[PDB]
Amino acid sequence: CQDVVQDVPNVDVQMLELYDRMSFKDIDGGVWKQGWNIKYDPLKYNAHHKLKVFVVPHSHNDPGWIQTFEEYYQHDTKHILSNALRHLHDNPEMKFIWAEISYFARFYHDLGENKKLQMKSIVKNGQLEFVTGGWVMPDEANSHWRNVLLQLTEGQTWLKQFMNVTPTASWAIDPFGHSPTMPYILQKSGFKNMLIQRTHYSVKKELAQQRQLEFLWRQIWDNKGDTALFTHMMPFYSYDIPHTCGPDPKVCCQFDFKRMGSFGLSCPWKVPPRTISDQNVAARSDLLVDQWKKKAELYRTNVLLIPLGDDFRFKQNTEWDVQRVNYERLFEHINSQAHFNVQAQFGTLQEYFDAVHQAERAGQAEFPTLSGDFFTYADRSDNYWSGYYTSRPYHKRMDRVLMHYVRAAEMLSAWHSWDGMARIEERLEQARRELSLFQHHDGITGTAKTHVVVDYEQRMQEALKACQMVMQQSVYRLLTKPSIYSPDFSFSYFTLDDSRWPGSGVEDSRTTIILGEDILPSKHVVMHNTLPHWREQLVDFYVSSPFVSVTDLANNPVEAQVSPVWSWHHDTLTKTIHPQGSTTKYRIIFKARVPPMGLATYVLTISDSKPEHTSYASNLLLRKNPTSLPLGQYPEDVKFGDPREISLRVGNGPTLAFSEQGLLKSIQLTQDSPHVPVHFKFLKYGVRSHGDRSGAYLFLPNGPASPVELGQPVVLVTKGKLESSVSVGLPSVVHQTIMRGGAPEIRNLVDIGSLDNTEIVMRLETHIDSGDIFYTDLNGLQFIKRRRLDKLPLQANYYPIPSGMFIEDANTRLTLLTGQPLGGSSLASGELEIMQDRRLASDDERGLGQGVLDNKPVLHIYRLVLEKVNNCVRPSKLHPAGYLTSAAHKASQSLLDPLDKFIFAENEWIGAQGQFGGDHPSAREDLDVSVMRRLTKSSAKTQRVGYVLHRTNLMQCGTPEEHTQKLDVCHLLPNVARCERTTLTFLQNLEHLDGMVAPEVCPMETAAYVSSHS
């Protein structure tokens, strides 16, 4: 295994280093506005060394943006694909590349058998080529690597089954900034090449000048370079035709033959395209070839890529003709005019890359190595696209919830083979596809029109229900005596109970377990643990009585705590935000212990009086002019008082101190240690009254944030033996700090209401001497070092915070883990800040056609980990990466993959069992079974189950961390006949494993295995 901590990789280009040196001056470079006047030696090419040009026709189809997926399909895409089939069929030399499989699958299944055959033939012969082959072209900032893999797998699995092809070249022309998580996944999925486009205009200029636009992209910690994937970065402002033929859009626009008038399109540079004729072909070619040769100067080989397309292009037959015919005339002339020394033709992406590597092998070019990412993107001036790191936060959070539900549903149902009548495969396919769809660069990004966002939400809602159905059916089968098991595949044996989604104050959705002497004395509940190690976690349920006790299936009592059900309300009368307690519903909390990838059953029983093993939390409402707060049967009376600072400590965990406004002020790790200053504060950013305005994509603040006026907020303090908390009703946010014995959990019920042109940020202020350094994660896969650059505007220093961020000095580190992707930064030494929501009245001119005024209450969740790191073995000062500690990693897992909770629906569960998976191996803490998916239906003689294993890297800080079993996923199911290592998509077998044993992976490595069972 490579050491991912102590060996600083030696690369030609390291993005953090490059950023440190670059000046980012935005000067007018001429026709190529953000570059310079490219010059070339005409004698460079000749009869013995020609420029090979590949014109690659394409059509960018968004699975939703300003129209829904179905609206686009009906109005544009089905016509684009229908005419592509016809035109390619009739013109053997014409080529076309396709990226979005969600659309292709929709189209193909609607085609008649005759057409399906014609389609398969033009793919087999190389005319129609799939690039990437994912369900969508995913966002690369907010997306979790697990979902990036899910959607890629969904698309490629379809392609393998119906088109008999697996793309090895990736095409990503629209994501707003690019992440190394892509080559990581692609390189481990059989890919050999990838192309990207949206990178900072300053980076394009810098790399172009050094001819480093094509490079071997390796991971920041990869010293050997085995993760390297050849990458081609386009050099210009856009992927449209005016910005793909060469440096001058005024000239290139003249070669987009769909802009002559009848199509309602034109050239903004005032020079329209002209139909090619024998009369003007020589002059037209001279102009075009000149653009090509200038573009060619930015690269190292004699093979040139020239994309030919735009949004939803190649729809009308007339369009296919006008583009094909005119280009055929140009090719015939150019290729027959020796003085040009050029050979041009229509080609595919793979054809381009094959030629490039042929030139490389011929020894005509050597490519530079590179590590780092391409965030934060800016397409011009100071317009940095850090706004979408936060836009539509409700759905960003929903993404993480569904991500987990999909994993849990696939894993729970993978243990058994199911009869087709159970509709298991059906529901899981729907769930995977709706989640995959949302990974689109206009989905999770929060950059779609209001009604499209609604469509995505509806789709995810159906996916969640599908997951629940599969999960509950699975639990019933796994925990019921076999000879008693009698399933009704349409029946709900269990109801999922989720305390954090949609969340309290967002939607009263969770059911109350109703118990009573005259109706029902007890109720069974079951917890599921998708993680491959034994896990304990507090779980809570709503009950109709405070007099409830918990026991496991062995009838062993389990210590529990009951607390009231508090709901915050904006009192329109008193103009105050205060909590009201329920007099009929209560929360019971207890510690559940679940086997690795297993289940554990408990029983809740009601009694006439306070049970022996159940304690009751005290409650203190701090505020002036208080009013009574009755709580029905609740044992203890609420106490009141004027606002004041308070301190709390649960178990032997840390001691937290709060201000009289209910905000964190300090953290004391141990009774000995000091009170480390850690202050939470809420501020607000505005919008500029002059110039460019912030929108769904752009973050253009009118200066540093201003503190939110808090007034005299109402603070609620709940103190319990197992869980305590401090909640405060602030303007736009009910802020809550929950303690259970370890790092606190933070929950924000964010309702920006009608505060137009406002962006709410949550900031942490400390004494940590971090300087200008901070760390953020990329797709929940790795942590990359960031350097605040004062030479860049505030918005440029904002980065994606998909799952976590941290700052540290020689001795102390503060890590904030998230349960949803949001935007954030460290604008000053010792600070961390992350945006909660943003409401913008104006459009930011990128095509959306609207601002963001559809905000809705969302419950954001976090874990705040303060730790001493002076004893940790960390990377040298020059290493571009950072790594989490065991505590921080486990805290992240508690947010993204918590225990699942099931409530038995009927009055009695006959044949109930108390546990499943007690014999499952408990793997080392840095290892996870990211995916467990049965790949075969019940009719298959040889069953196959696929596993994706990921091992992260945790810092060694002196903790022994011992006794853990080796995890061999190939033996998780009985009767294993073979074990094979496969690509992450499970589509290609890479190794036949002896002894049928799947070995664990190295730190920061991800592998996939498929076990076959007879």
Ligand X SMILES: O[C@H]1[C@H]2[C@H](O)CCCN2C[C@H]1O
Q: Which residues contact 940 (CB under 8 A, 6 or more apart)?
A: none
Does 379 contact Zn ion by CB under 5 A?
no
Q: Which of 847, 911, 918, 995 touches ligand X (CB under 6 A)?
A: 847
E-strand stretches of 869-971: 881-882, 900-904, 915-916, 927-934, 943-951
Residue 174 known to bind ligand:
yes
Q: Which is nearer to ligand X, 300 or 392 (CB)?
A: 392
Q: Which residues contact 362 (CB under 8 A, 6 or more apart)?
A: none
Residue 294 interacts, among Zn ion, ligand X, none and using kind-specific CB cut-offs from 5 to 8 Å, with none
Does 399 contact Zn ion by CB under 5 A?
no
Does 423 contact ligand X by CB under 6 A?
no
Question: CA-CA distances (angstroms) from residue 749 to 289, 505, 753?
Answer: 59, 7, 12
Contact 169, 349 (CB under 8 A): yes
Q: Which is nearer to ligand X, 174 or 980 (CB)?
A: 174
Residue 205 beta carbon to Zn ion: minimum distance, rounded to whole angstroms: 24
Residue 60 beta carbon to Zn ion: minimum distance, rounded to whole angstroms: 6
Residue 249 beta carbon to ligand X: minimum distance, rounded to whole angstroms: 16
Q: Which is nearer to ligand X, 310 or 808 (CB)?
A: 310
Contact 191, 170 (CB under 8 A): yes
Catalytic residue, candidates 3, 90, 139, 174: 174
Q: What is the DSSP letter of 909?
A: -
Residue 497 interacts, among ligand X, Zn ion, none and using kind-specific CB cut-offs from 5 to 8 Å, with none
856 class by beta-carbon count within 10 Å (0-12 exposed, 13-18 middle, 19+ buried): middle
φ, ψ of residue 43 to 5 degrees: the values are -80, -5
Residues 63-102 that bind ligand X (CB under 6 A): 65
Does 944 contact ligand X by CB under 6 A?
no
Q: Which is nearer to ligand X, 449 or 528 (CB)?
A: 449
Does 450 contact ligand X by CB under 6 A?
no
Q: Which of 12, 26, 286, 311 touches ligand X (CB under 6 A)?
A: 311
Residues 669-708 that bind Zn ion (CB under 5 A): none
E-strand stretches of 530-663: 535-543, 548-552, 557-558, 560-571, 576-594, 598-606, 614-616, 618-622, 639-641, 646-649, 655-658
Residue 379 beta carbon to Zn ion: minimum distance, rounded to whole angstroms: 13
Gyration radius of the chain over CA positions: 30
Q: Which is nearer to Zn ion, 238 or 335 (CB)?
A: 238
Q: Which of 140, 214, 442, 867 touches ligand X (CB under 6 A)?
A: 442
Closest of 321, 262, 316, 342 to residue 82, by C-alpha: 316
Residue 1005 interacts, among Zn ion, ligand X, none and using kind-specific CB cut-offs from 5 to 8 Å, with none
Q: Which is nearer to Zn ion, 151 or 776 (CB)?
A: 151
φ, ψ of residue 603 to 5 degrees: the values are -130, 135
Residue 383 beta carbon to ligand X: minimum distance, rounded to whole angstroms: 12
| C-alpha 614: how far from chain center | 40
Does 843 contact ligand X by CB under 6 A?
no
Q: Which residues contact 114 (CB under 8 A, 6 or more apart)?
A: none
Q: Which is nearer to ligand X, 447 or 474 (CB)?
A: 447
Q: Which tokens belong to 778?
A: 């990329």
Question: Which residue stretch of 441-449, 614-622, 643-651, 663-671 sits at the interface with ligand X (rule: CB under 6 A)?
Answer: 441-449
Question: Which residue stretch of 59-67, 122-130, 427-435, 597-605 sits at the interface with ligand X (rule: CB under 6 A)?
Answer: 59-67
* CB atoms inside a 10 Å sphere around CB 37: 11
- Helix, strand or coil, per DSSP, at residue 991: strand
Residue 447 interacts, among ligand X, Zn ion, none and using kind-specific CB cut-offs from 5 to 8 Å, with ligand X
E-strand stretches of 187-302: 193-196, 214-217, 229-233
Does 256 contact Zn ion by CB under 5 A?
no
Residue 62 beta carbon to ligand X: minimum distance, rounded to whole angstroms: 4
Residue 58 beta carbon to Zn ion: minimum distance, rounded to whole angstroms: 12
Q: Which of 144, 324, 433, 441 touches ligand X (CB under 6 A)?
A: 441
Does 759 contact Zn ion by CB under 5 A?
no
Question: Which residue stretch of 439-447, 454-462, 895-903, 908-916 sits at the interface with ligand X (rule: CB under 6 A)?
Answer: 439-447
Residue 329 interacts, among ligand X, Zn ion, none and using kind-specific CB cut-offs from 5 to 8 Å, with none
Rounded to an integer, what distance in angstroms lies between the CA atom of residue 120 and that of residue 99?
16
Contact 730, 708 (CB under 8 A): yes
Rounded to an integer, what distance in angstroms lies between the CA atom of residue 307 and that of residue 311?
13
Contact 834, 822 (CB under 8 A): yes
Residue 300 beta carbon to ligand X: minimum distance, rounded to whole angstroms: 29
Residues 717-756 that bind Zn ion (CB under 5 A): none
Residue 62 known to bind ligand:
yes
Q: Residue with the closest Cβ to Zn ion?
A: 174
Question: CA-CA distances (angstroms) from residue 96 to 123, 144, 232, 313?
Answer: 10, 30, 19, 11
Contact 732, 570 (CB under 8 A): no
Residue 388 beta carbon to ligand X: minimum distance, rounded to whole angstroms: 8
Q: Which is nearer to ligand X, 447 or 563 (CB)?
A: 447
Residue 745 interacts, among ligand X, Zn ion, none and using kind-specific CB cut-offs from 5 to 8 Å, with none
Rounded to an integer, what distance in angstroms lies between the CA atom of residue 952 and that of residue 146?
13
Question: Which residue stretch of 57-65, 95-103, 454-462, 569-577 sits at the interface with ligand X (rule: CB under 6 A)?
Answer: 57-65
State in Å, rounded, how far the first CA of the chain is from the last one. 33
Residue 847 interacts, among Zn ion, ligand X, none and using kind-specific CB cut-offs from 5 to 8 Å, with ligand X
Rounded to an integer, what distance in angstroms lies between the CA atom of residue 894 and that of residue 887?
10
Q: Which is nearer to ligand X, 256 or 540 (CB)?
A: 256
Residue 60 known to bind ligand:
yes
Residue 846 interacts, among ligand X, Zn ion, none and using kind-specific CB cut-offs from 5 to 8 Å, with ligand X
Q: Which tokens belong to 1006?
A: 């991800």
Write each residue from 130 to 169 as x if it is in contact with ligand X (CB under 6 A), else as -, in one continuous string.
Answer: ----------------------------------------
Is position 3 annotated as part of the catalytic site?
A: no
Q: Which of 32, 51, 62, 284 touches Zn ion (CB under 5 A)?
A: 62
Q: Which residues contact 57 (CB under 8 A, 6 or more apart)?
A: 94, 95, 96, 97, 308, 309, 314, 323, 346
Residue 248 interacts, among ligand X, Zn ion, none and using kind-specific CB cut-offs from 5 to 8 Å, with none
Q: What is the three-state SS of 843-888?
A: CCCCCCCCCECCCCCEEEEEEEEEEECCCCCCCCCCCCEECCCHHH
Angle between helices 145-163 and 113-124 (to 10 degrees): 110
Question: Which residue stretch of 60-68, 224-232, 297-305, 910-918 sits at the interface with ligand X (rule: CB under 6 A)?
Answer: 60-68
Does 846 contact ligand X by CB under 6 A?
yes
Write each residue from 164 to 183 as x if it is in contact with Zn ion (CB under 5 A), else as -, in one continuous string.
Answer: ----------x---------
Closest of 511, 470, 514, 507 to residue 492, by C-alpha: 470
Q: Which of 100, 129, 174, 497 touches ligand X (CB under 6 A)?
A: 174
Closest of 114, 55, 119 to residue 83, by C-alpha: 119
Residue 633 beta carbon to ligand X: minimum distance, rounded to whole angstroms: 53
Q: Which is nearer to ligand X, 97 or 464 (CB)?
A: 97
Residue ranges binding Zn ion (CB under 5 A): 62, 174
Q: Which residues are annotated as a binding site?
A: 60, 62, 174, 441
Please identify every residue annotated as catalytic.
174
Residue ranges binding ligand X (CB under 6 A): 60, 62, 65, 174, 311, 441-442, 447, 846-847
Q: Which residues are annotated as a binding site for Zn(2+)?
A: 60, 62, 174, 441
